[PDB]
Amino acid sequence: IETVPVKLKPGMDGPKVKQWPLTEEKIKALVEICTEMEKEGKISKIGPENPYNTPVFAIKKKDSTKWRKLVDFRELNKRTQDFWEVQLGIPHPAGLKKKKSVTVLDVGDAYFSVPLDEDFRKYTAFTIPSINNETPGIRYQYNVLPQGWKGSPAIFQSSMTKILEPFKKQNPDIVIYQYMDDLYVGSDLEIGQHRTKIEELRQHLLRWGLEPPFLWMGYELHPDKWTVQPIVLPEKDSWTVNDIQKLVGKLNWASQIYPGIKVRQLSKLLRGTKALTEVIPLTEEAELELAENREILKEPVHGVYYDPSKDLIAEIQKQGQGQWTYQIYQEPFKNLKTGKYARMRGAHTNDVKQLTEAVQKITTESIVIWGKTPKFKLPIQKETWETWWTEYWQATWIPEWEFVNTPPLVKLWYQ
Amino acid sequence: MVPISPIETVPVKLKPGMDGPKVKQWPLTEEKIKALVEICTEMEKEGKISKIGPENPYNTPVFAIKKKDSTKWRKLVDFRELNKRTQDFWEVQLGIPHPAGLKKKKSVTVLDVGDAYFSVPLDEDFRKYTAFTIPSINNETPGIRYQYNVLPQGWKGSPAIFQSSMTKILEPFAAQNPDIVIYQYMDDLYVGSDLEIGQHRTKIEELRQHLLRWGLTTPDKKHQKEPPFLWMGYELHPDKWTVQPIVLPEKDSWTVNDIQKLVGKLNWASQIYPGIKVRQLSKLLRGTKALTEVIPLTEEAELELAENREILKEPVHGVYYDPSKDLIAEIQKQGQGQWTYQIYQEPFKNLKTGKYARMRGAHTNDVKQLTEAVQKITTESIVIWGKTPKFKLPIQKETWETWWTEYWQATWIPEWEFVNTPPLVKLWYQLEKEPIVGAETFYVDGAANRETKLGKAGYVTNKGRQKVVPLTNTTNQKTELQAIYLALQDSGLEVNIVTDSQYALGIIQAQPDKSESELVNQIIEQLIKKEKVYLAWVPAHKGIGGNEQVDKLVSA
Ligand SMILES: Cc1cc(/C=C/C#N)cc(C)c1Nc1ccnc(Nc2ccc(C#N)cc2)n1
Ligand SMILES: Nc1ccncc1Br
Ligand SMILES: Nc1ccncc1Br
Ligand SMILES: Nc1ccncc1Br
Ligand SMILES: Nc1ccncc1Br
Ligand SMILES: [Mg+2]
Numbered sequence: 001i002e003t004v005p006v007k008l009k010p011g012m013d014g015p016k017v018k019q020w021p022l023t024e025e026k027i028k029a030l031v032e033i034c035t036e037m038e039k040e041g042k043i044s045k046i047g048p049e050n051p052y053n054t055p056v057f058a059i060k061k062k063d064s065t066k067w068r069k070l071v072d073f074r075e076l077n078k079r080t081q082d083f084w085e086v087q088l089g090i091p092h093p094a095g096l097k098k099k100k101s102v103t104v105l106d107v108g109d110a111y112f113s114v115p116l117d118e119d120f121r122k123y124t125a126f127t128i129p130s131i132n133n134e135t136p137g138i139r140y141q142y143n144v145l146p147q148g149w150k151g152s153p154a155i156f157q158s159s160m161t162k163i164l165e166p167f168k169k170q171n172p173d174i175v176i177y178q179y180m181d182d183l184y185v186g187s188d189l190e191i192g193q194h195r196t197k198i199e200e201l202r203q204h205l206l207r208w209g210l211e212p213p214f215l216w217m218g219y220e221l222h223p224d225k226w227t228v229q230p231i232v233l234p235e236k237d238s239w240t241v242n243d244i245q246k247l248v249g250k251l252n253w254a255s256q257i258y259p260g261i262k263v264r265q266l267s268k269l270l271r272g273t274k275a276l277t278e279v280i281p282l283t284e285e286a287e288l289e290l291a292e293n294r295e296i297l298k299e300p301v302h303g304v305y306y307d308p309s310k311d312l313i314a315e316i317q318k319q320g321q322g323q324w325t326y327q328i329y330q331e332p333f334k335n336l337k338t339g340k341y342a343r344m345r346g347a348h349t350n351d352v353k354q355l356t357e358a359v360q361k362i363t364t365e366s367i368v369i370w371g372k373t374p375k376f377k378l379p380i381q382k383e384t385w386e387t388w389w390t391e392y393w394q395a396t397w398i399p400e401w402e403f404v405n406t407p408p409l410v411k412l413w414y415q
Numbered sequence: 416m417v418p419i420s421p422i423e424t425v426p427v428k429l430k431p432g433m434d435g436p437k438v439k440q441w442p443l444t445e446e447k448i449k450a451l452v453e454i455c456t457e458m459e460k461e462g463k464i465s466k467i468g469p470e471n472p473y474n475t476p477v478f479a480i481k482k483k484d485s486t487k488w489r490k491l492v493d494f495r496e497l498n499k500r501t502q503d504f505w506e507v508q509l510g511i512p513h514p515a516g517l518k519k520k521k522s523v524t525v526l527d528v529g530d531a532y533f534s535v536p537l538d539e540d541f542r543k544y545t546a547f548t549i550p551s552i553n554n555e556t557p558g559i560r561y562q563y564n565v566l567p568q569g570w571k572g573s574p575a576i577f578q579s580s581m582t583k584i585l586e587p588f589a590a591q592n593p594d595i596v597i598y599q600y601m602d603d604l605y606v607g608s609d610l611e612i613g614q615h616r617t618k619i620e621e622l623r624q625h626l627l628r629w630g631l632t633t634p635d636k637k638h639q640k641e642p643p644f645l646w647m648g649y650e651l652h653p654d655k656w657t658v659q660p661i662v663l664p665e666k667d668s669w670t671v672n673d674i675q676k677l678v679g680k681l682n683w684a685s686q687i688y689p690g691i692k693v694r695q696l697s698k699l700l701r702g703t704k705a706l707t708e709v710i711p712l713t714e715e716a717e718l719e720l721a722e723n724r725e726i727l728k729e730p731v732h733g734v735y736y737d738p739s740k741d742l743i744a745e746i747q748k749q750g751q752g753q754w755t756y757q758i759y760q761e762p763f764k765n766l767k768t769g770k771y772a773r774m775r776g777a778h779t780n781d782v783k784q785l786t787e788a789v790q791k792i793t794t795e796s797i798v799i800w801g802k803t804p805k806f807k808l809p810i811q812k813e814t815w816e817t818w819w820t821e822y823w824q825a826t827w828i829p830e831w832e833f834v835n836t837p838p839l840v841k842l843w844y845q846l847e848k849e850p851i852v853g854a855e856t857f858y859v860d861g862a863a864n865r866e867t868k869l870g871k872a873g874y875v876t877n878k879g880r881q882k883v884v885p886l887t888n889t890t891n892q893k894t895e896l897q898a899i900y901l902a903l904q905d906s907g908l909e910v911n912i913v914t915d916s917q918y919a920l921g922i923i924q925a926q927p928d929k930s931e932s933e934l935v936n937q938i939i940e941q942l943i944k945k946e947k948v949y950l951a952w953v954p955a956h957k958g959i960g961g962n963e964q965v966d967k968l969v970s971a
Contacts, residue, residue: 021794024801047425048575051503125505131801132516134596135589136507136582242850245913245953252954267958273858274961275877276850276911276951318825351825380825381783383790388827407823407924409917409952 003117004155007081014052014123015075019137020386022057022129029058029067030128034140037069042112043140050141052125057390066213068106070148072398076123077150086158092371096175097223099186101194102368104219106396108147108181109212110163110205111156116144124149147181148396163208167201179367181396186223194220223368229325229338229414231257231297233290242276244269246412251293253413257333258296265289304334312336312374314362315404316355317411322348324358325414328366328374337369338414347392355380356392363399376401379408419630422534422584425576427541429500435473435544436496440558443550447479450488451549455561463533464561471560473546491569492547498571500544507578512598514649514656515686515758515767516799519735520596520607522615523653525640526622528581529602531631535566535580545570588625592618603640648683655732658687663724671708674699681723687733688726689768694751695719734764736800742766744792744804748781748838754788758796758804769795778927778935781840782818785810789828806831810840817842823924843928844942847949854909854947855880857902858961861894861916862970871969872897875961880905883968892918894969896934903941903948910948915955915962923950 008014022030037043054076058067096102116124124142145152153160157178164176174197177184185201187194198218205215231254236243248263248270255261265285274280282290307330316326322344328337341361347353359376366374378385382403429435443451458464475497481488537545545567548558566573581599589597595608595618606622608615623633644651648659661684666673678693678700685691695716703710712720740760747755752773759765771788773779789806796804808815808831819826850856856877863870863886872894873883882901886894895916902912914920922935930936942948953959956966 021797022801023797027801048505048507048572048579049425049427049502051505053505129510132512132799133510134512134516134598136578139505240850241856242951245951245959248957248959249953252957263957270953270958270962271960273875273877273879273964274856276856276913276949277852278877318823320820350827351819352827355825378825379823381787383787383794384824384826387790387793406921409920409924411823 001115003115006083006117006120006151006155008079008123009081012079014125015054015079016051017053017055017072017075019053019055019127019129020057024131026058026067027128027131029060030056030069031138033058033067033069034128034138038140040112042144043142046122046125046139046141050122050125050139052123054124054126056126056128059390059393061394068214068396070393070396070398071124071126071146073146073148073150074398074400079123080150083151083154090178090371093175093177096177096184096186097226097369099175100188100222100224101191102184102186102221102223103194103198104221104364105183105185105198105202106181106214106217107178107183107205107212108152108396109215110160110208111145111147111152111181114145114152114156114159116142116146150180153178153180163204164201167204171197177368177371179371179397182367184368191220221364221368223365226365227339229340231413233294233297238279239269239282240277240279241270241274244280245276247290250413253410254293254297257301257335258299259302260296261293262289301334304336306330306336306370308370308372312366312370312372313377314366314374315377315408316358316362316379317408317414318351318355318379319411319415322354324354325411326358326362327414328362337365339365340414352380352384352388353392355385356389359389359399359401360393360395363395363397367397373397373399375399377404378402379404381405420628422536422580422629424536424538425572425579427538427572427576428502429544430502433500435500436475437472438474438476438496440474440476440548440550442554443479445552447488448550448552450479450481451477451490452559454488454490455549455559459561461533463565464563467543467546467560467562469557469560471543471546471562473544475545475547477547477549492567494545494567494570497544501571504572504575505579506575508574510798511647513767513799514651515733515736517651517656517735518596518738519609519654521609521653522612523605523607523642523644523651524615524619525638526604526606526619527602527634527638528599528604528626528631530633531581531626531629532577532602533565534630535577537563537565537567584626584629584631588622592621594618597622600646603638605644652732655734656687657730657732658683661688661727663720663727668709669699669712671700671703671710672706674710677720684727685770686767687765688731689757689765690726690747690749690755691723691768691770692719692749692753692755693770694753694772733767734761736760736766742796742800742802742804743807744796745807745834746785746788746792746809747836748785748809748840752779752784754784756788756792758792767799777932778922778925778930780843780926780928782810782815782842785840786826786828789831793829803829807834808832808840809834809836809838814841817845821845822926843939844926844945844948846923847947850911850949850951851909851947854911854949855906856911856913856961857906858913858965859895859898859902860914860962860965860969861886861891861896861898862966863889863891863894865891870894871971872901873965873969874898874902874905875965875968877961881965881968883965892916893934895919896922896932896938898965898969900934900938900941903938903945906945908946910945911951912948913951913953913962915953915959915966917952920950920952 055072057070059070060067121141124146127137127139129137175186202215248266251261251263266289269280269286310330312328314328316324319325322342324341326339327335329335341358344354344357363373378401476493478491479488480491542562545563548560550558566576585597595606598605642653650657650659661680678697681691681693696719699710737760742760744756744758749755754771757765757768771791773784793803811833857874859874861872868888870886870889871883875881896919899919
């Protein structure tokens with residue numbers, strides 16, 4: 001009811017980010033959405049004395065006709081003060097990633113109940129463009145906490161705990177975690193018992209509301225299901241020259257991650273100029289070396305530790321046939337997580353759709369485990385990605401990304 | 416009097432930490448001063464400015480310039496200093512409509528709205544920063560001090576405040592009259608419709624009546640402007656559009672500056688004239704910036720210009736957008752990284768055309784370029800029409816499938832069909848995924864001395880074939896490529912090649928069909944005449960014999 005004071009960071013001006021081209025269907029959707037929001041006091045039209053801008057688009061489920069407004073606040077979130085006034089932050093719940101079920105809810109609609117500081121509103125300016133710029137873009141700013149902005153969960157956090165206060169002591173084993181517009185609710189209970197308690201939670205929020213367009217949704221994860229990718233070497237009865245070459249290449253790379261890995265005795269087998277397809281019998285010294293290497297690869301990487309002060313970096317490789325590998329790290333060769341996907345649904349002839357879904361799944365894994373999104377290195381040309389990723393995006397947040405333009409030779413080793 | 420609703424002020428600020436201007440008023444000839452006094456008396460009478468006292472500490476210089484061939488002066492207030500201090504505004508006119516996205520209209524009438532610009536009030540708290548001084552005759556009295564009450568000609572905030580004030584006025588009219596379009600351009604209003612002459616003229620009068628609500632009068636004597644309109648370099652007709660005349664000059668010698676004008680005209684023409692090319696004429700500009708250096712035109716630049724002249728020989732027009740019909744985009748390869756395209760909905764009547772130019776790169780191929788051209792057309796089409804066109808591409812469906820499924824990057828192009836119009840985009844080689852049984856295996860290596868630039872490149876094979884070539888003025892990267900070239904040159908139609916060059920693998924795994932390096936080009940030519948090539952990588956200096964043997968040979 002009374003606004004919390006909020007500032008930009010020192011020497012930083014508000015965002016002035018270009019609005020990118022929108023399809024006719026998204027413009028129509030946003031014109032209806034914003035008309036309703038202005039009617040309900042959430043946003044107001046602004047004048048030309050406001051030079052700021054953040055881009056907007058919209059996403060929807062294929063079977064919904066209801067669109068979700070998505071403001072891309074990445075720049076504003078960078079330029080907004082970090083609030084350590086009431087808490088230095090959230091001690092990220094390490095037990096969340098251990099629950100047999102975690103349901104993801106969009107609770108961002110609750111944010112609209114809190115007014116935004118009157119001096120800060122101008123920095124939330126956005127524009128609804130017109131096809132072919134035939135009419136001037138419609139300019140608005142927010143009067144209330146906007147979804148997608150870093151400040152909204154912080155300022156609303158005092159109210160959010162006070163709404164979960166019946167769920168608090170009634171279900172003391174449920175871990176609840178908030179990230180941007182998302183609420184993560186973890187439990188070890190049977191899937192039917194889990195869902196009832198999810199709907200249990202929804203009512204507490206709809207109760208407080210007295211309507212939220214998307215709180216009824218529920219994306220269900222099973223972090224207990226989440227798999228890893230250790231380094232494994234082939235088990236063969238006969239090795240060609242080529243097989244041994246690729247083994248020593250793989251071991252060469254792995255020696256950058258694992259110290260005791262040796263390739264001396266195996267390299268010695270490549271002594272000679274034989275046909276690539278000739279079978280070479282394994283010497284016993286090479287047999288020993290291979291076995292010792294296999295046992296090294298069974299252990300964890302040494303000196304691996306998460307530091308919350310550093311960025312997370314995520315790399316992705318296209319392996320073909322709808323398969324994608326990825327690694328999350330902070331320092332090179334100190335992987336905090338590796339994985340592999342194949343279940344890219346509804347995209348057997350669209351690489352970019354698959355990569356986009358991979359990016360979203362990796363980001364939600366990162367949010368669950370460390371409470372923050374990674375910076376992606378994407379194996380795609382910038383113009384291809386920028387033209388299409390908003391057509392397949394289904395999440396309420398957006399990570400940062402850069403583009404890889406030279407083929408990694410290590411793609412071979414995560415195969 | 417009839418009450419008129421006021422036009423509400425935009426609050427305006429100076430930039431943080433900055434103050435208003437305090438700039439010298441230079442002395443004026445006695446002639447200029449009397450003219451400015453009469454000028455300012457009429458503007459003061461009409462309300463545009465007001466006399467102020469001497470407390471206001473700000474000042475902006477005023478000048479007297481007058482129209483050639485006349486005798487009634489005009490006032491120029493030079494707001495350069497105040498503009499440096501005025502806050503930034505939202506600029507809306509940055510994105511200009513493209514004619515190919517417009518809709519056909521039966522009638523387009525023009526209204527004069529010059530009266531409004533000077534009735535748009537300036538924020539009261541900002542007016543003090545607009546102060547100016549008419550110098551006194553012989554400088555024997557205080558100069559006459561004025562400030563603006565309205566948006567001044569030449570001030571930084573006037574275009575964006577004027578436009579947003581007109582938008583607010585016109586908004587409800589347009590919203591309650593969805594059978595017309597309205598567009599404002601300076602002191603002109605354009606209203607188009609498909610109505611019968613009847614309701615169209617009535618709609619015009621309603622608009623005049625609506626404007627009168629704010630006291631904005633429009634002239635009764637109807638406008639000088641009638642279609643076709645000359646606007647932003649185009650000629651707009653009711654049912655078609657084109658660019659304004661594009662006349663390529665006859666010249667014997669061509670200057671840096673003259674070629675820069677030639678290229679600009681060609682770029683402007685290429686949005687409706689199909690097949691325009693500028694690569695050779697633009698590459699007469701490489702790095703140089705001596706605005707008047709004379710450049711000889713290469714044999715290529717002359718063939719390109721002659722090509723362009725024949726294309727500009729007759730006028731060509733585009734049609735407007737029909738939202739009830741699909742958009743089709745067709746792309747052709749032109750050579751030397753140049754691509755050309757047409758966008759249409761009906762056969763033989765283009766909405767617009769265009770071109771795409773290959774980026775500066777070291778290695779490239781046609782499929783990558785075609786892909787980038789498609790992404791460019793797609794984004795331009797979203798801007799102009801709000802939707803992606805259906806594509807007609809000169810690449811077989813088989814070729815594309817082979818490309819994207821094996822390419823190391825994720826890649827995508829939207830709904831498209833093959834069009835069989837040469838030259839077709841194709842894959843010139845494809846590397847094997849497995850080693851070839853029965854094919855000779857070449858273990859290649861090169862090395863170069865960093866100080867002498869002497870090197871060697873060569874191979875050894877499983878058949879005992881060997882070669883080492885001494886090389887001058889080379890590097891390790893060049894010698895590793897040379898070794899791969901020698902293996903290709905000396906092998907049969909199927910070959911396994913083993914290298915330790917991470918550098919060479921990174922190039923070949925990018926699948927180029929053309930390079931800046933003549934050595935990569937030589938390798939590409941060799942790859943094209945093979946039936947099967949398997950390229951295998953292994954780590955250097957680990958003990959890999961064959962690799963170790965030719966490494967011992969080339970590093971001696
Ligand atoms: C951008 C624009 C510039 C001018 C005029 C600019 C100037 N000077 C006039 C109008 C009415 C518009 N706005 C729109 C909007 C949608 N379709 C059209 N079609 C359209 C416009 C002109 C002619 C003609 N002749 C035919 C069809 N115009
Ligand atoms: N995350 C979402 C995706 C699609 N529609 C709505 C929401 Br909320
Ligand atoms: N519909 C959704 C999609 C993705 N995450 C969360 C929700 Br709820
Ligand atoms: N403000 C407007 C709304 C619709 N058409 C034109 C204008 Br100007
Ligand atoms: N970048 C280039 C320049 C000239 N020819 C080929 C290429 Br590839
Ligand atoms: Mg070497």
